[PDB]
Structures are given as structure tokens and as C-alpha cells.
Amino acid sequence: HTGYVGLKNQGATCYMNSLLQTLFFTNQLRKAVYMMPTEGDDSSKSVPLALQRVFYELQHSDKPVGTKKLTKSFGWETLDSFMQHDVQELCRVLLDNVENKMKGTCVEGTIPKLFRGKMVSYIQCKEVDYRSDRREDYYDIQLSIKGKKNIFESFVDYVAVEQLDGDNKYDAGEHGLQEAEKGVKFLTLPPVLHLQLMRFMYDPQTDQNIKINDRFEFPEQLPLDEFLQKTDPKDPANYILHAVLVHSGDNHGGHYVVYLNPKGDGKWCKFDDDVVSRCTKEEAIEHNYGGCTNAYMLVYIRESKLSEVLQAVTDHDIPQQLVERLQEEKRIEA
Amino acid sequence: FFRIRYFATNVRCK
């Protein structure tokens, strides 16, 4: 009654069902995942093949979709495995294996094209003229929310310059200890932007976590051109909200649900494991600010690359050798 | 864990 099918809750997988729906509706990722040459892989341990089955089943099955063979493929069959990892770690586990499988084939370099961005982090001396530039990549950004009112205020805190004065002077080597300024600047933003909000904190005093249920606002449209170093016209960093991963509860109780507008048209649905239901745009955006139910991860897509990232995926996009192998497997289950 | 750390989910140790 929604056009989309859900995922089974086969124990305690937490954020995994929410993450699989996010990656499955990254249509450029989905079509590229179908392209992987996996005819000769082992179904017991091949997670690229395992991800294809889940994607094919999410596209065709009328019944809730199973993930048992997928969890077994990357070694997280223990029910504690998902509680002992963050949502970004799981995504890196999936993306690393599909990108390594894409090496040497026609869909090589997909993962860097969608999710990779370029970041610089510097240290600039105040007295002497020494600067240590450091260029590195990212596939996801961790934002601080405690004290910060909205996504605007978390991005300014991410780039804010830190003063390395006092007994915290920077070791400039030959220049000796020097007062300095450390900071981070963004060079490029990826077409599909993964943003994890730090809604949880372990203090060492008491041996337990603590959830930030403070109110944190995020927009449907996020212009990030201000935070880009060397902004270019004709391609602003204007992003559109696609997914909002939601955790409700406290330090002990917790449920992981995701809201998504599939086609990018602002028509939202709630994906509660096996129950998919239409929902208002306010329930997916403004009801998840907090102040308890609130969001912990956000997925944005560049408006310029919006059309090709969310391109329609038809049955012809799935290779027939893959198709015949999955429909093979389906016949042996029965 | 043994220090002030943040996560996006309820991450526990092993």
C-alpha cells in the first residue's frame, strides 16, 4: 500500500535495517551494485553478492525481506555485533567490499564518486611563518550537537579555528614551541553526503553511555557553499534532505527507524523494520528534532547531481546472469 | 572505553 517493502527484524540488528534502506534508495549505488561480476563468488561469504540479493529482494519481494545471509557474510552474526559498532562503521564495511569488488570492472570508482569528499586540516603558527597542511579524504562527517542549535551551528564549530597557546603550543620542530591555530576546511562535498550527529557520549565516570536528547534542527534544503573553500558558481553546494535515521529512547531503551523520500519529491514514508507506512513531512523532519525521539544520522544529496543519483532503476538494469543465480537460490529454499 | 567519546548510536564495548 506504499510501493516499498520492509526488512525483517531477525533479532537485534539496530541501525542496519535503516542503513540498508538508505543505500538501497541510493539508486546510482543500487544500479552499480547490480553490475558487479559475482557469478563465481561463494554465497556463504560473499557480501557483494549478499548485498545484491537484499537489493533485488527489496525491489521485487511483496513480503518482508530477510538479512540473515547478509549478516553472516561480513561476520556480524552475533546479536551483540551491531551494538558494538556505530552506524558509520557498518556503512564503511559495506562500501569497502563493493568498491574492492568493483576494482578492474566497468563500474570502478563508483563509491568515491558518490560518497568521497576532500578535506584539509591545517596548523598555522602565529609568530613564525610555518604551516603544516594535511590533505585527507572522508566518506562521512561527524557533527557535534551539544550546545548547537541547528546544522548551521554544527558546521561552523567544525571549521572554527582552535588556539594552540599556553602550555599547548604547537611543536614546530626547528622553530620550537610556537603559538598556533589549528583548523579544518572543506575542499569538495560528495554528491551523497552522510552526516552522523553525535547524539551519544560515554563518560568514563559512570560505566554507561548518555544520550543527547537536546533539540537539533536540520533543513529540508541545506546550502553548504559558505563552508566550501574556493566556492565555484554554476554548481552550488545546495543539498536536499533524502534520509533521516531516527533513534528513540534513552540510555537503555532504543528503537531504530528511518524516514525517506524515495524519489526526492518530498513524499515521505516511515520504515519501521517490516512496517512501511506513509507519513507527513513534519513527522519525518520537524518531529525528529528532539527536546525522546530524535535523529542520529542524515543523508543529503546534491541538487545538481540529484537526478543521476536518484535515477529510476528498472528490471533491465539487473544482469540476467545475476538474476538467474538469485532465482536459482530462491528455488532451493523452497 | 576509557575516555570521553561520542557516537551516533548506543555503542557498547567488547
Could you please report the per-residue DSSP string of A219-249?
A: -SEEE-GGGBSS--TTS--EEEEEEEEEEEE
CA separation, residue A113 to residues A109, A195, A260, A265, A275 (Å): 6, 17, 22, 23, 32
Single-letter code of the amino acid located at A97: N
What is the stated resolution of the deposited model, in angstroms?
A: 2.6
For chain A, give every domain's residue range: 6-116+304-334, 117-138+159-189, 139-158+190-303
In whole angstroms, give the CA distance from residue A184 to residue A120: 6
In whole angstroms, give the CA distance from residue A151 to residue A94: 27
- Experimentally determined by: X-ray
Single-letter code of the amino acid located at A259: Y
10 Å Cβ neighbour count for A117? 18
In whole angstroms, give the CA distance from residue A181 to residue A164: 6
| DSSP state letter for A161 | P
CB A70 within 8 Å of CB A50: yes
10 Å Cβ neighbour count for A239? 26
A193-A199-A202 Cα angle (round to 5): 125
Q: How far is B1 from chain A (nearest CA, A)?
A: 7
A286-A289-A290 Cα angle (round to 5): 125
Single-letter code of the amino acid located at A53: R
* Residue in A84, A144, A209 nearest the CB of B14: A84
CB contact under 8 A, A83 and B12: yes
Class of domain A117-138+159-189: mainly beta
* Residue in A198, A203, A256 nearest the CB of B7: A198
C-alpha cell at A120: 584539509
A141 CB-near residues (< 8 Å, 6+ apart)? A158, A193, A194, A195, A196
C-alpha cell at A300: 543529503
* Residue in B5, B8, B14 nearest the CB of A202: B5
Helical segments of chain A, H only: 16-24, 27-34, 47-60, 68-73, 87-101, 110-115, 151-159, 281-284, 306-309, 320-333
CB A333 within 8 Å of CB A66: no
Decide: helix, strand or coil at residue A27.
helix
In whole angstroms, give the CA distance from residue A183 to residue A141: 15
Taking an 8 Å Cβ-Cβ cutoff, which residues of chain A contact chain B? 14-15, 80, 83-88, 142, 144, 196-204, 209, 211, 247, 251, 254, 256, 296-297
Reference A120, options A131, A108, A109, A107; nearest CA is A131
Of A1, A106, A125, A255, which residue is the catalytic one?
Answer: A255
In whole angstroms, give the CA distance from residue A132 to residue A125: 9
CB contact under 8 A, A200 and B11: yes
